[PDB]
Design a protein around this ligand. Sequence first.
Ligand SMILES: Cc1cc2nc3c(=O)[nH]c(=O)nc-3n(C[C@H](O)[C@H](O)[C@H](O)COP(=O)(O)OP(=O)(O)OC[C@H]3O[C@@H](n4cnc5c(N)ncnc54)[C@H](O)[C@@H]3O)c2cc1C
Ligand SMILES: Cc1cc2nc3c(=O)[nH]c(=O)nc-3n(C[C@H](O)[C@H](O)[C@H](O)COP(=O)(O)OP(=O)(O)OC[C@H]3O[C@@H](n4cnc5c(N)ncnc54)[C@H](O)[C@@H]3O)c2cc1C
Ligand SMILES: NC(=O)c1ccc[n+]([C@@H]2O[C@H](COP(=O)([O-])OP(=O)(O)OC[C@H]3O[C@@H](n4cnc5c(N)ncnc54)[C@H](OP(=O)(O)O)[C@@H]3O)[C@@H](O)[C@H]2O)c1
Ligand SMILES: NC(=O)c1ccc[n+]([C@@H]2O[C@H](COP(=O)([O-])OP(=O)(O)OC[C@H]3O[C@@H](n4cnc5c(N)ncnc54)[C@H](OP(=O)(O)O)[C@@H]3O)[C@@H](O)[C@H]2O)c1
Lengths: 303, 303
Amino acid sequence: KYDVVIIGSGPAGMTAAMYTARSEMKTLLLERGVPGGQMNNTAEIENYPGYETIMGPELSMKMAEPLEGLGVENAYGFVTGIEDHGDYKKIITEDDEFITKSIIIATGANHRKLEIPGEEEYGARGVSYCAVCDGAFFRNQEILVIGGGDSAVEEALYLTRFGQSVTIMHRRDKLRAQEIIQQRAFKEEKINFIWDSVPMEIKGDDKKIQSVVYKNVKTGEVTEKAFGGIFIYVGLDPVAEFVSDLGITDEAGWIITDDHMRTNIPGIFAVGDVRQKDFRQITTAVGDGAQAAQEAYKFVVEL
Amino acid sequence: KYDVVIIGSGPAGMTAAMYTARSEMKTLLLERGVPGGQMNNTAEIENYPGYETIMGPELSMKMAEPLEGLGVENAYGFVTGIEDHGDYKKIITEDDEFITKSIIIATGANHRKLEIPGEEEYGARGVSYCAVCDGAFFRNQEILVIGGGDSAVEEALYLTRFGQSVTIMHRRDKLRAQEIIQQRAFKEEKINFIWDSVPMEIKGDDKKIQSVVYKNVKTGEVTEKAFGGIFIYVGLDPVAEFVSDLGITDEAGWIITDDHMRTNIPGIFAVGDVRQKDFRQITTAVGDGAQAAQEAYKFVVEL
Ligand SMILES: Cc1cc2nc3c(=O)[nH]c(=O)nc-3n(C[C@H](O)[C@H](O)[C@H](O)COP(=O)(O)OP(=O)(O)OC[C@H]3O[C@@H](n4cnc5c(N)ncnc54)[C@H](O)[C@@H]3O)c2cc1C
Ligand SMILES: Cc1cc2nc3c(=O)[nH]c(=O)nc-3n(C[C@H](O)[C@H](O)[C@H](O)COP(=O)(O)OP(=O)(O)OC[C@H]3O[C@@H](n4cnc5c(N)ncnc54)[C@H](O)[C@@H]3O)c2cc1C
Ligand SMILES: NC(=O)c1ccc[n+]([C@@H]2O[C@H](COP(=O)([O-])OP(=O)(O)OC[C@H]3O[C@@H](n4cnc5c(N)ncnc54)[C@H](OP(=O)(O)O)[C@@H]3O)[C@@H](O)[C@H]2O)c1
Ligand SMILES: NC(=O)c1ccc[n+]([C@@H]2O[C@H](COP(=O)([O-])OP(=O)(O)OC[C@H]3O[C@@H](n4cnc5c(N)ncnc54)[C@H](OP(=O)(O)O)[C@@H]3O)[C@@H](O)[C@H]2O)c1
């Protein structure tokens, strides 16, 4: 009944959907939230070819805008499962089922947790995984950012608009982030570093975070220091719960594809951050999206 | 001496260069012409995620703009050859040589010729491979467009601004172009079709084209019809002459990479339209560009 259903309306799904619709495939784009995916949780995007800088939520709106006119059917849906019925597939959401010849899974990734004490307890009250979402609640605080990658370092630089200071705690003595971003953080007077360290406990009073205990990974030295907020950027986990059963994921839960975005299962493709891969960017999300869309057309043409 | 040299400043090279520069790699971007590559020969781009429509040359300027500020060294160069010296490589242009640890080849593709009589003879005087370049010279003419793909059908639709009529001659009875573009051409009153046909001869007077002879591929029927211009869109050939010797191309001349944009030769990558692949789009150019850029960084880090 659908030629293709695309699950998730971040940049990978939005690209796939634009391409399927332009092939005049009967296209459903399901999204549980706001179109844009992780881009809506991004302050400034500097490395999307075509824009010198752009706010994440504006890029999300720009990518979503043409879809309706192209004939993509945009619908609300949280997908809970997928069933392969050979020559068609069924997609189950909270309330609905959809039948389709092909599926492109574009559900992205989610913040990894530290799995330390206080992390759950201070959820709404000093612990955050989204700087653009939460930053302004921390005006004039001493903010802590955990991690050493692109997100941690970029989001620390963003947070310097709000905090008195921002400290980046990284578990080694060399960041992973792109060098241009490292150098910006090195130079920024309001960014401090706690190198070779990991957080052990987040502590607070009845109602908000007050301090963080941490440990040096070369010496075991343990320090407790006062902070007003903690933003955690320690990597990603796959958002692929609805395919756990299907035999298309690796040991960590990422969806395995070949170079044409195909899974094991004919007519089920995956694109973007949800895939097993190393390089998670908007550029490669878009690329993947386009490739899967062409592969889905071909698959359905053959069917 | 360079960490990376990127050869060609279309969207694949421009993306690669942006990414290498952001990794603080000493980056040279050589281009023989104008930044933008095939995008400068494109009228309206509707399917680049982030823009609902944009003129090709404007998208080219937008993609080129940040490069200087990021520290990419933009230089004129026509590359004539590359020599692999194990732990470095040499790149030869008309007048220069450049030594580099890594290379990303992003030189794209060029219009395939019909290799028919009159095609060379009427080069500047009715025969064209670029509608945005030449279209306005054909105001009020009966224009012919040869081919059945995305370029032929899109460029025919563009040319209807100028010609009295535009006729698309395709060698089968079904176009290859994206269905949205086919349907637009079907509906457009100024587009005619010559199905199941190929051009055999382009004829003219001393000074300009006047007519085209063609043949039906199912019946052999031969017809001669008057036209004022002919635009040819019969596919692509690789732009890879400078690596013919190196063992990295297929029988047609396309550069063979794996999924991480690597050729045979360590530290030589290829991206975008020049690669052996099926799906040549700006989206996948950009994706390839980004992937190669991350692979080059890693390669050079290791070296
Ligand atoms: C803070 C931060 C800054 C970043 N900055 C940049 C940058 O500057 N440049 C860059 O290139 N990359 C950047 N990235 C990476 C970039 O945002 C991602 O690579 C890209 O968004 C991934 O796109 P995607 O479409 O694969 O996944 P996503 O954007 O993750 O979208 C997945 C979508 O699927 C939906 N979804 C999930 N599960 C379901 C379900 N079960 N049913 C329905 N819908 C579901 C989600 O709601 C989401 O909208 C950044 C990431 C972060 C966190
Ligand atoms: C008429 C037309 C319309 C199109 N419309 C669209 C569209 O709407 N959407 C879309 O997604 N795709 C479209 N495309 C496809 C898109 O333009 C290409 O996929 C994309 O430009 C390829 O980028 P690239 O960087 O790999 O190659 P290119 O853009 O081909 O750039 C290659 C560059 O390398 C340079 N170069 C070549 N040889 C050398 C040398 N020896 N030394 C130095 N420099 C050299 C060239 O000057 C060029 O600037 C269109 C193509 C055409 C022809
Ligand atoms: N501008 C952009 O292009 C952009 C922006 C944001 C994100 N992204 C991409 O999105 C993906 C996710 O990036 P990310 O930064 O979110 O994740 P990431 O690359 O996995 O980096 C996580 C960082 O946190 C460190 N870390 C992990 N556990 C830690 C702990 N317990 N204590 C302290 N530090 C810890 C990691 O250490 P190690 O380095 O030791 O592993 C790593 O440096 C990446 O591929 C990234 O490039 C891109
Ligand atoms: N909007 C966009 O995304 C966009 C726009 C332009 C181009 N592109 C991409 O750029 C690449 C190049 O596209 P293209 O259209 O330039 O090339 P293409 O896809 O190779 O199509 C060439 C067309 O001409 C036909 N043909 C070949 N020889 C012919 C002859 N002698 N007489 C009449 N017709 C003939 C082919 O026939 P058969 O079909 O029988 O082979 C084909 O339909 C493609 O991957 C394309 O999708 C994309």
